[PDB]
Each structure stands twice: as C-alpha cells, then as structure tokens.
C-alpha cells in the first residue's frame with residue numbers, strides 16, 4: 669500500500685493527508701483511487717498512465733488546473749465510470765471525453781469550467797447518470813449544452829447563470845431526469861416548454877433565483893414531481909390571472925423568504941397562496957416585504973381587502 673494511503677482490495681484512499689504530490693508506487697491493479705482534500709497543485713504528465721484498471725477516480729478539493737480535460741490520455745484508463753474533479757481550479761475542455769464513454773458519475777462542482785457551455789462536450793456520454801456542474805462559472809446560452817445525455821437522472825447546475833436570465837429548452841433530451849437543481853442561477857424568465865419532457869422529474873430546485881412571478885402552467889406535465897423549491901425568490905404575482913393547481917403528485921412547495929407584496933393589487937394571488945396551505949413548508953417564514961405597514965407579517969395570517 670502506497671505511503672499515507674489506506675488499501676482495501678483494489679481500492680486506495682489517500683484523503684485529507686495534506687499531500688503535495690501523488691503517492692509513489694500506486695499499483696496497476698488499482699480500480700478505485702481517492703486523493704481528496706489534499707494540497708495537490710499539479711500532476712506530473714502521465715502520472716496515471718499505468719492505472720489502466722481504474723473505474724473510480726476522485727481528486728476532489730486540491731489546487732489542480734487542467735489545461736486539457738478529459739481523455740483516456742489524462743487518466744490512463746478507458747474504463748472510468750466515476751470521475752470527481754470538484755473543488756479544484758480551472759478546467760479547460762479540449763477533448764470531449766475521448767476514451768471515457770463509460771462514465772456514469774461526473775462531478776465538477778466549484779471548479780472553473782471553460783470551453784464547455786458553447787459546445788456539446790457530453791455528446792458521447794450515453795451512460796452518464798449523474799452530472800454536477802454547480803458553481804462552475806458557467807454562462808448558459810447555447811441550447812445544446814447537454815446534448816447526448818439521454819440516460820441522465822441527476823443534474824446539478826446551481827450557482828451559474830443564463831443569457832438574458834432566461835431558461836431555454838435545454839432539457840428536451842433528458843427524459844429520465846429525476847433531480848434538477850437550478851438554484852442560485854439569477855433566473856427571471858423561463859420558456860413555457862422548458863420542463864415539458866421531464867415526466868420522471870421528482871425534485872425541481874428553483875431556490876434563490878430572481879423570479880417575480882409564479883405560475884402553474886410550466887409544471888403541468890410534471891406528473892412525477894414531488895418537491896418544488898421556490899424559496900428565496902421575489903415572487904409577488906402570476907403571469908396568468910387564473911392559476912390552476914400544481915400536479916397532483918406534488919407534496920412540498922417551498923415559498924419561504926419571498927418578497928410578497930401584501931397589497932390590494934395582489935389580493936387574488938395571495939388568496940391562491942393561502943389555498944396552497946397543505947403544500948407549503950414553514951409558513952411562518954412566508955412574510956410580506958411590502959407595504960411598510962405589513963412588512964414582516966406572515967402572509968397566511970392576513971386578510972387582504974380592497
């Protein structure tokens with residue numbers, strides 16, 4: 669077993685050891701390798717060339733930058749199923765996962781991704797089930813960003829942003845999605861058809877965007893949806909005057925910490941909000957932001973009159 673590592677079968681873990689270099693003598697038989705929470709600032713060229721049996725690799729939480737990710741030439745193996753490069757430096761995409769088509773789990777969270785959003789870099793990853801590109805300084809504009817991800821079930825993309833603060837139809841190929849995190853993306857508007865193909869979606873996180881309205885129409889097709897998180901937006905009205913119901917599958921609607929406008933101008937919307945009581949969570953944290961004389965009051969404890 670390499671120095672400062674723990675070995676079990678073909679698995680090697682060398683985590684939180686303050687390592688500045690990759691341990692020497694890692695055997696070619698290794699199938700899983702974790703070097704997480706260390707101080708690796710660079711990897712010598714072809715350091716992984718002998719690790720041809722690797723199915724799992726995590727380099728999470730180091731100071732690594734990749735001038736050309738990601739390919740079998742970068743990691744030696746062509747049988748990688750799990751790659752975690754989260755909490756690192758700059759990751760530039762020069763190769764579209766050449767030789768890494770077996771990937772099932774991919775994590776880039778809190779690393780600065782470059783040359784990804786303008787292209788369809790995931791085109792070959794027909795087996796990918798989990799993708800995390802949260803907080804990657806990604807500006808979404810090109811609609812084909814996720815082309816190829818037919819099998820995807822979990823998509824986390826929190827802490828990014830969209831051209832024109834607009835959510836386009838970027839999920840149309842992702843029919844197997846069960847979890848979608850779009851929180852903290854500065855969103856203000858969405859395509860009415862953005863979620864129409866997502867019949868298996870169970871959790872949709874829209875928390876801490878910049879929406880001023882809430883409607884039921886974009887969620888009409890979401891007949892597997894259980895949790896809808898709209899906390900921390902600026903919701904005070906709806907596009908449509910006549911709001912319907914959310915899908916019957918829905919169990920939780922989070923509207924806490926929205927800047928509700930408790931005025932006669934929004935009597936109808938607020939009445940509809942009251943009627944969603946059985947869906948709502950922590951109702952004490954649903955408070956009026958305006959007008960001044962009602963600021964801080966729980967929305968459900970108010971009867972607005974004109």
Ligand SMILES: *[C@@H]1O[C@H](CO[C@H]2O[C@@H](C)[C@@H](O)[C@@H](O)[C@@H]2O)[C@@H](O[C@@H]2O[C@H](CO)[C@@H](O[C@@H]3O[C@H](CO)[C@@H](O)[C@H](O)[C@@H]3O)[C@H](O)[C@H]2NC(C)=O)[C@H](O)[C@H]1NC(C)=O
Nearest residue numbers: 930938939942943962965966967968969970971972973974
């Ligand atoms: C927010 O509003 C609700 C409902 O609004 C109704 O309030 C009543 C008083 C009336 O003006 C009506 O036109 C409104 O639509 C308030 O809930 C109601 O509270 C009153 C007073 O406690 C209840 O009245 C009582 O009714 C029973 C018979 O049902 C009588 O025996 C009593 O004498 C008494 O009059 C009424 O039942 C409540 N409504 C129901 C059934 O939930 C609520 O208090 C109010 N909140 C505030 C303070 O803003």
Ligand SMILES: *[C@@H]1O[C@H](CO)[C@@H](O[C@@H]2O[C@H](CO)[C@@H](O[C@@H]3O[C@H](CO)[C@@H](O)[C@H](O)[C@@H]3O)[C@H](O)[C@H]2NC(C)=O)[C@H](O)[C@H]1NC(C)=O
Nearest residue numbers: 871875876894895896897898899900920921922923924949
């Ligand atoms: C708005 O309200 C919803 C519903 O109460 C909150 O959703 C909750 O979010 C947390 C954190 O994501 C979930 O906890 C997670 O649970 C799974 C196990 O199911 C576990 O693997 C994770 O480690 C984590 O603990 C929780 O399940 C979820 N609640 C429900 C009922 O779905 C949400 O946090 C609220 N939003 C904000 C910003 O407060």
Ligand SMILES: *[C@@H]1O[C@H](CO)[C@@H](O[C@@H]2O[C@H](CO)[C@@H](O)[C@H](O)[C@H]2NC(C)=O)[C@H](O)[C@H]1NC(C)=O
Nearest residue numbers: 794795796817818819820821841843844845868
């Ligand atoms: C989407 O998910 C479903 C599972 O709900 C996949 O369908 C299964 O596919 C396997 C073969 O890999 C079959 O053995 C199962 O019988 C299928 N389940 C049923 C009953 O439909 C489907 O392949 C996934 N789609 C993609 C493109 O990955």
Ligand SMILES: *[C@@H]1O[C@H](CO)[C@@H](O[C@@H]2O[C@H](CO)[C@@H](O)[C@H](O)[C@H]2NC(C)=O)[C@H](O)[C@H]1NC(C)=O
Nearest residue numbers: 826849851852871872873874875876895897900
């Ligand atoms: C939606 O995303 C937000 C973050 O954008 C989640 O809220 C955070 O939850 C974690 C627990 O995993 C806490 O450590 C943070 O303090 C929370 N942050 C905020 C914004 O208060 C939220 O849990 C997500 N919702 C769902 C349903 O998963």
